Amino acid sequence: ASMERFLSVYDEVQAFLLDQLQSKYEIDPNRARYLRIMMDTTCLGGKYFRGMTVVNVAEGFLAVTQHDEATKERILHDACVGGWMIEFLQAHYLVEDDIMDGSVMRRGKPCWYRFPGVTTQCAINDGIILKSWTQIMAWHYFADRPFLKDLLCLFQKVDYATAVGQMYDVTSMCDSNKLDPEVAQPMTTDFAEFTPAIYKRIVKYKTTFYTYLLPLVMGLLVSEAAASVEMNLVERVAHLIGEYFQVQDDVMDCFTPPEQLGKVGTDIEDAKCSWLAVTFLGKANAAQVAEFKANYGEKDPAKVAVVKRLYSKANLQADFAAYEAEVVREVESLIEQLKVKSPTFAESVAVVWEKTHKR
Amino acid sequence: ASMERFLSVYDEVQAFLLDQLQSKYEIDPNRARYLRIMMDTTCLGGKYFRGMTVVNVAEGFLAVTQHDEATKERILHDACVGGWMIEFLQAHYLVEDDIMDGSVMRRGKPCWYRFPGVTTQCAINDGIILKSWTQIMAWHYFADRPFLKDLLCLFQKVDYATAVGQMYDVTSMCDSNKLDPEVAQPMTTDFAEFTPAIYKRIVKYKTTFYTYLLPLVMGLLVSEAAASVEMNLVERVAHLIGEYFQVQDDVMDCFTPPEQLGKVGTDIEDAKCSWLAVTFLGKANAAQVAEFKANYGEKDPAKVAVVKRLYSKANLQADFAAYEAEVVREVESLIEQLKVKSPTFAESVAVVWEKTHKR
Ligand SMILES: c1ccc2sc(N3CCN(Cc4c[nH]c5ccccc45)CC3)nc2c1
Ligand SMILES: c1ccc2sc(N3CCN(Cc4c[nH]c5ccccc45)CC3)nc2c1
Ligand SMILES: [Zn+2]
Ligand SMILES: [Zn+2]
Ligand SMILES: [Zn+2]
Numbered sequence A, B: 001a002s003m004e005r006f007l008s009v010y011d012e013v014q015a016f017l018l019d020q021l022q023s024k025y026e027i028d029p030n031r032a033r034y035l036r037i038m039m040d041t042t043c044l045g046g047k048y049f050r051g052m053t054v055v056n057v058a059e060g061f062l063a064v065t066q067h068d069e070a071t072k073e074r075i076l077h078d079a080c081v082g083g084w085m086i087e088f089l090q091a092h093y094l095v096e097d098d099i100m101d102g103s104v105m106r107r108g109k110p111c112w113y114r115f116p117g118v119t120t121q122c123a124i125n126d127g128i129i130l131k132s133w134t135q136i137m138a139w140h141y142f143a144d145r146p147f148l149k150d151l152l153c154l155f156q157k158v159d160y161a162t163a164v165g166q167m168y169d170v171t172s173m174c175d176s177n178k179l180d181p182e183v184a185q186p187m188t189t190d191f192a193e194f195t196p197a198i199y200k201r202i203v204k205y206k207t208t209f210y211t212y213l214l215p216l217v218m219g220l221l222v223s224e225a226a227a228s229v230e231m232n233l234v235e236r237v238a239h240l241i242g243e244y245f246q247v248q249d250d251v252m253d254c255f256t257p258p259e260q261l262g263k264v265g266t267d268i269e270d271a272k273c274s275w276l277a278v279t280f281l282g283k284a285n286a287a288q289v290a291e292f293k294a295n296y297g298e299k300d301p302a303k304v305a306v307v308k309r310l311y312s313k314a315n316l317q318a319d320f321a322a323y324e325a326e327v328v329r330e331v332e333s334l335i336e337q338l339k340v341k342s343p344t345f346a347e348s349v350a351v352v353w354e355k356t357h358k359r
């Protein structure tokens, strides 16, 4: 099975990275063990959706393209390595974002920095190593590949867009005209920047490039199939499915039980520009807006309870149903446009959409 | 002058990065201003030794190689951009290492994370952006250069070695057999790992690759002059000068006044494996070792004063003078070996050594 091959390549990449630390970096066995545990804890335990998208896109092309068996194996192995580059990039983001946000739990366990023998002093650097490993993988496994240059260039652009997205996210509750490194930042009082367009910018950059665009395009690159699809359609469909994925995440932060979510959601206390806050402000009357302003962005559980009640009473399920219906309609139109140049790729996009919509 | 051209290219690279954030990343003017201030605060104010080494190596080759004037200008501009890639890589390290170590001051001002409108939540990500900018520079300015592939591969290897070096540094006061993410780490009691070989490993990885190896080799790459020098000699001389630079830094942390140093040195309170601690343990009697163990790695200023007195009474100046004499002798031997294939490059190495030795 595809998942089995993907998971087997993790063990191979881990062994390569750790053996290289021993043969070239004078690592000792105890530090190699620490890094092995850090890699497992930070990289494993998710659903591997991003990495598996690379594998699925490559499998689709293998079914319609003439290749020797050894070439099919090479392409699948490259798709698995590429998929792990994305999972390790995600691991870097999660480690650093958990430290930045002072998060407590992730994937049902404590955040990496909270492990007793880790601490923030080590975890920041462990996060740096996770991203460095993505490059060591690429240069080693893809050394002689025709797609190495395009892959590294794409990966770097996606990583930069993601870091810019994190900046948009962490500053989304401040007034833009007050941003100033020299002055402590107050929370917005008018919430004028909680709009659909501003929310869409945050999400586009913080999530969609690395969660949807990069796995889809990497699958095309390892398949030598990019100059067969319309890139503007790939970007449009990735940014559309990516926003829906984040909207689902935002709703879950507020209403999915901590055991199912794997953490206690704190977007309200954190004053995040979430889909729920923007949608609520898009339909609230004057008294509801005033009540939201008096309670949002506060740790006090009674204030968080007022916000959750405002959301529940505003029938945000009706807005989500209308948003969902519109996304279903636009994703299906883009898949149709994708069929003009590639039915196989349009099918992988339909799979990606089905796994997102029904998660 | 060389410095003038180098500093002029900073303004050009800054404008390119910020204009790209506006034209491609939907940045707003307030966030572009925040990033401009972050870039200036974190990248400027040092001596630019690393970036200027790239420029000096390239100038040396220009003086002995036939080129059209436009080609000389292109090579110098590439050496300046490459130099800024290293200065921005250093800026990334300093931002993250100041957060990891809980440092207070850097280059005579507060550490970036301590600025009132920054905070750790933003500063970790600002540090990530600084390194992403090094890649955006390379792909933009060096898009059509023959050396792009070698330069990116070298840069990545140097960055990874540096992150591994940071891990060696932050864990240098723990016993290797006790490292365990699940268990809070006690400080060593035996100091058995405070040896010259272990100290040399820490320094080799945490400082020498990015401070000496990368600027020297990048100068060779932008000059299309690498396949003219013996790479094993370049690595040997970079690792030798780099260790001396760190030994000087270690001595300054302990004995250079806070105003000249630009910070209050805390290597003793931090229990760092410094040249001073290793050298002291290499000559101390049983009572001196016991007194060091009772006082090292503690915040108590009276305990720090006992350690500084132990160092002063141990005549570590005599050990430094012998170390220095040996480095002078070995650096001169390596420069001689470098003259076999390139007098010009051996001269740049002599300049680099003179600037390090007499800083
Ligand atoms: C899509 C978009 C918006 C929404 S709103 C939502 N709801 C389902 C659970 N309801 C009860 C509840 C569970 N936990 C709570 C905590 C506080 C207040 C109330 C509750 C609250 C509303 N479902 C969606 C789906
Ligand atoms: C190279 C290698 C080792 C050393 S040791 C050193 N010294 C110069 C200043 N001396 C006085 C001092 C200044 N500040 C202090 C604080 C506490 C105790 C004492 C002092 C202490 C010893 N110079 C070097 C140079
Ligand atoms: Zn976050
Ligand atoms: Zn969330
Ligand atoms: Zn440090």
Ligand SMILES: [Zn+2]
Pocket (backbone or CB within 6 Å): B249, B250, B253
């Ligand atoms: Zn120091």
